[PDB]
Design a protein around this ligand. Sequence first.
Ligand code: GNP
Ligand code: GNP
Ligand code: CL
Ligand code: CL
Ligand code: MG
Ligand code: MG
Lengths: 250, 250
Amino acid sequence: HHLEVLFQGPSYFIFVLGTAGSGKTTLVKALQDYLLNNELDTAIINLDPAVEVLPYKPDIDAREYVDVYDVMNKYELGPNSSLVISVDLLLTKAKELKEDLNQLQANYVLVDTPGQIELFAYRDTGKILSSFISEGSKSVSVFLFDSYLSKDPKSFLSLFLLSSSIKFRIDMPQISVLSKVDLLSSSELERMRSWIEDGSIIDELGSIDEYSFELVKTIVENLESFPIPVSSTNFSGLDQLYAEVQKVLA
Amino acid sequence: HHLEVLFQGPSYFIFVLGTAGSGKTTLVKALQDYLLNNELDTAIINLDPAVEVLPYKPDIDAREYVDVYDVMNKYELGPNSSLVISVDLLLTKAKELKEDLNQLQANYVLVDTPGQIELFAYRDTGKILSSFISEGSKSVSVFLFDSYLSKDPKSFLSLFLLSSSIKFRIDMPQISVLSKVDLLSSSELERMRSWIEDGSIIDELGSIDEYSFELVKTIVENLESFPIPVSSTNFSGLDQLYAEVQKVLA
Ligand SMILES: Nc1nc2c(ncn2[C@@H]2O[C@H](COP(=O)(O)OP(=O)(O)NP(=O)(O)O)[C@@H](O)[C@H]2O)c(=O)[nH]1
Ligand SMILES: Nc1nc2c(ncn2[C@@H]2O[C@H](COP(=O)(O)OP(=O)(O)NP(=O)(O)O)[C@@H](O)[C@H]2O)c(=O)[nH]1
Ligand SMILES: [Cl-]
Ligand SMILES: [Cl-]
Ligand SMILES: [Mg+2]
Ligand SMILES: [Mg+2]
């Protein structure tokens, strides 16, 4: 017999990114339900070492590799630097991690990430880790535009800047999602869609210095499409999201 | 007698902002030492409800107003959303806070902030809170460019984007500081200074899509000055920083 030989198939990694509280962990659970309901084998990787309660069962869990509170004590750091270094420490255990990855056998692998967006936008950590965990496989990032933050036009545009910094750093395609869309009224959603798909957002800014205006002009001039509206609680928009994942990975 | 009548003088609020671990809390302590060594009356406000150990004695402390861990339990949130909501909860106690502010009597008030930069760049929380705590007084924000992150040109430019989003949202002038400069060699510092003061950074980018290039061009075209090099551990650059604070507040 040969016990090194395992059944092989395609694996697709889906990294769910977003600001604090934008709904990443809930969406991972909802997207896993959706994919399994459609007979698509799906596993979950939790990369947040600080989370306490999860609505899903992670197949790989960062909390078994690094103790955040032990880090904050052993290095005398602040609450946020401690979470950054903890994620950084994951890469020191690349040996143990690659073994867990090897023994993982799933067609779709959902990666829940911490709601510290500087790890993906302002540091190399997000790129190095995401490339390490998805090595040898196609990947896509899903970035969550929090609906609560997006209904304000100036706040919406800052999130497009943030998402662009992530896309530039991470080495994979990115899908934009408008998360928690149930928090919006019909008129708010339509107004936001017109802001983007028609460029009218530039008028909702009013008093803006010349510098910020030039950034905004560049953003709006390169807005390809409106973020996919998703509501994990209402379990809506997951088919659009999964249709775009398939279009991107193909 | 009239016991409502207190001695009045000018107060200047200095908000120290920056990415996780950029050195905010250490710089606050160093800047307080510097100002007191020069016979300048200085108090400290700690706005980070999650910090465990501080090198200074805060005159107002957010931890006495909100319990972060109690928030994460009572609302079933993640580790980062819990810290955002905790800061948000501070404004619910505006009554108690304004009383502490009133009873504060200091010429310079240093405000240590949490290393969750979305509170200042991607949410209104930072603006509302900073305006509330400094009401009736001149204020300045000090944003920390972490030297470790700034030595990579693409990482430096993303931090200029981030600092611009903060400056646009916060309603006060902002001073840029290159923190932890002791981590850099002489050649690295000079190279970074040439990147900015001469615009040569645009060549250190190499393979860049057209969209990211247009953002970078706008950033570099509006780089007024190089961030002030500060090293709290070497206690250097604090006089330059304090000379610029005075120039801005005047
Ligand atoms: N080399 C060097 N290290 C510094 C300097 N200032 C702070 N540090 C170190 O960098 C780490 C972060 O310092 P700290 O003041 O807590 O930064 P913070 O930005 O408040 N962290 P947080 O975002 O978690 O609140 C600590 O190890 C501190 O000793 C500096 O000027 N040089
Ligand atoms: N209305 C609404 N609330 C949602 C939705 N998805 C999540 N939430 C709620 O929003 C809060 C944040 O959800 P959570 O999945 O933990 O988000 P997270 O982005 O992983 N948080 P963190 O950044 O701290 O890890 C929770 O109260 C969750 O119930 C949604 O689609 N609609
Ligand atoms: Cl890092
Ligand atoms: Cl908010
Ligand atoms: Mg989460
Ligand atoms: Mg701190």
